[PDB]
Amino acid sequence: GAFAGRRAACGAVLLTELLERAAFYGITSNLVLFLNGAPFCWEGAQASEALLLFMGLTYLGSPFGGWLADARLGRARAILLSLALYLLGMLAFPLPATFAGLVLVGLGVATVKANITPFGADQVKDRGPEATRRFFNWFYWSINLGAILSLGGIAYIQQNVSFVTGYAIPTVCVGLAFVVFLCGQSVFITKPPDGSAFTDMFKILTYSCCSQKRFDSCKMSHGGPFTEEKVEDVKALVKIVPVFLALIPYWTVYFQMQTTYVLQSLHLPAAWLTMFDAVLILLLIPLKDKLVDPILRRHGLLPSSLKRIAVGMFFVMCSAFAAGILESKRLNLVKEKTINQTIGNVVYHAADLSLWWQVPQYLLIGISEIFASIAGLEFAYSAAPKSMQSAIMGLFFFFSGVGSFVGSGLLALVSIKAIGWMSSHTDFGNINGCYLNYYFFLLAAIQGATLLLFLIISVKYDHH
Template sequence: MIYLVAACLLPVTAWPDGRLSVCGQLPADTTQNCSGHGGGTCQGQQQYCAPTIYTGLMLLALGVSSIRANLSSFGADQVKNQGRDTTQHFFNWFYWSTNIGAVFSLLVVAFVQQNISFLAGYLTPVTCLALALFIFLLATPTFVTKPPTGSEVSAMIKLAMQSWGCSWLGGTRERLGAHWWDLPPNKGAQPGAPSPEEDLANFQVLARILPVMLTFIPYWMVYFQMQSTYYLQGLNLHIPNIFQHDQDHTDTLQGYTFPDAWLLLANVVVLLALVPLKDHVIDPFLARRRLLPSALKQAVLGMFFSLASVLAAGIVEWERLWYVRHNQTVPQLIGKDHYLAATLPIWWQVPQFLLMGISELFVIIPGLEFAYAEAPKSMKGATMGLFFFMSGVGLLLGLGLVALLSLPIHGWMRCPEDYGNINSCHMGNYFFLLAGIQLVTCLLFIWMSRCYQSRPPQLRASHRCPRLVED
């Protein structure tokens, strides 16, 4: 519901009358739109929608995070008792479903926004969200649910601080767990809430999961290049005009422009094709021969594919800059922006998107499966939220690295102020740096996948203290 309310702010701000009601106004003396030369008069007050837009984005983030942290684990709960492999099938098709939504968003909504109106483009996802909420509410009686037992996060924070020696919480610097029976009972807990010893067991499990989660961060740094540097690279490659028409044939799409968001479709289309192949062919084939690797070992394989993807991007960038240095460029219009692109066709980017799509199959889907399977029973949502939280950390670190490399003195990513012009950058060096970071991560993850020992299935379903293996 929060997601839906926040999404409704977007079409309101795209509607002139809506902006009058939700946006403020800048004073006339602060506006820059003045007519004439020297002594001209300003055009009066202008609308100022930044507070409304940023408030909407914060609400969207709150809604998205609540859904992501709970929807995948909630969906897996619906099928976990229907067979041995149903959870694995669920996460395959869950991820496939999210990419169906991405195809619709990029292919249809982006085209409508760029060529028809932002109002119609924003109303489309609002309608979809409202329909999704309606279906979800209708299906509520059929869902497998469990009664709320209170938040485990506060208990985990308290145990962490106790393990760090916070005396005001009764903590010591002794190894946590030596005197778990001395933990005070949680008097305010709801019926069915974990006992103190169960809280301790959950804390110990999370302490084992956290290093694995942290090791996903460099992968996310590479993954989000698709929406940033891969995308920017594509804008500076030659894109065929799909809306061309000649004098003898009238094209019904005359006047429409190529939506730049379509450059992100390559990865999504790859996933739509590969997920069914993985679910129906690859996984059953490996399972019959008892060769199906664990989730962490699948993630190792996927990280090598992401390493290959960013290496391919670096090679394409070197080739693109060769064309630019030899004046083999062509002006092109993408959306409403002009680019001086290399004549190298954009199809050269297909391998890097294909490799990144394969990496998602073996990193993100097994990562979701790992987080769900290893999470304590009472902390499924929190653990899934932690998995997605690491993706945000990876994105921020990637942006921070770009900012660091964009410093004026010898910055590889230091580019002119001309929007979208990367012809004087050394973005290929940035790709190879990411490849080096990903290579170190792959080696670390190989060691971690060998040392990590999953909990037995009977312990995953219970609250008894598992015997932890020292790595």
């Protein structure tokens, strides 16, 4: 009965999210390749910088998207405006203009990502937190399904017809999402926030900050016009911030592992490797949702989101250790024979080893994801105040982007001449004379330290 009733609205929201994710992954799958192979052939550095700027704008727009959704507008209306801007920007690709289109697409996706999760989360808030947890599980499953569908269909229909349609496919998807969402609204009534006074909440926050400049906060605000709700929201946000601060290195390690696993698998369509992870997720989310959760319900072992994030961090560390061991074995084997292969239009030298040895580590990462990210989202919805859930989601996405940037900086920094772990990394391939195993071991050590710090912070937070 918990999932009955608004099932149609939940399915519509999941379909819209799937279409949005498919369009985004279609955009990001071969943007650099399309720009390089286009008649306006730029340099590799120029395309890389454009992609990095696009990703940074998408990461940065999420807090402002949540701010715009929370203030002077609703949630569904802000989603509609964001996806309209997304469609308008995406229409430019099949046709300075490129910069404007990238800006529009980035703003649209940043607002959509920041606003879709809180809306669907509050849509099922009628029942207990278990309904929200199941909704988040199916939300992540739909995201992965959309990723797989895009990364397959792009190549599936790219060969049949002209390549322009390859970029026209996401746009149509966006349009479809638009229509679906519109229809959903006609029967949504998913407890619309109707946020009008929430704008004042923002200025109240500033007033509280002024009260800081002019448990000190509680006693100071008791005398003034600072009714307990806003003070408790400020306290909750203050408690939340260190969690994200500790989670930033986790996102750094996550993105670095995502890049390095593909880079290593290249030496055993290039996007299919990434699909592997998603495929594993598509296999793991349902089974767990039907088996892992009930058993705890039988034993009363239901942990907090922080404990599940810690378990995910432990699985990440185990996967990093396994990847390091596999890289060491591959380096030991490769010092005797090499095999020349071609992927796309690039020649790579790979060791005489099967590709299935990547199955264990990937599997571990999958478990970590199904134990961590979703749980974090639940926390991102649970501890956040009811007034500014979208702002909290936007800040979380911004912190994830900052972690990704820190990971890229660390990857650049572990390539200095004094380090000596890699010298052919500047070249496209020939990672045979490199030391990626040491990089994996360093990532595992950093993950362990971050896990310990997060455990301490989680214990301190749960004590209060």
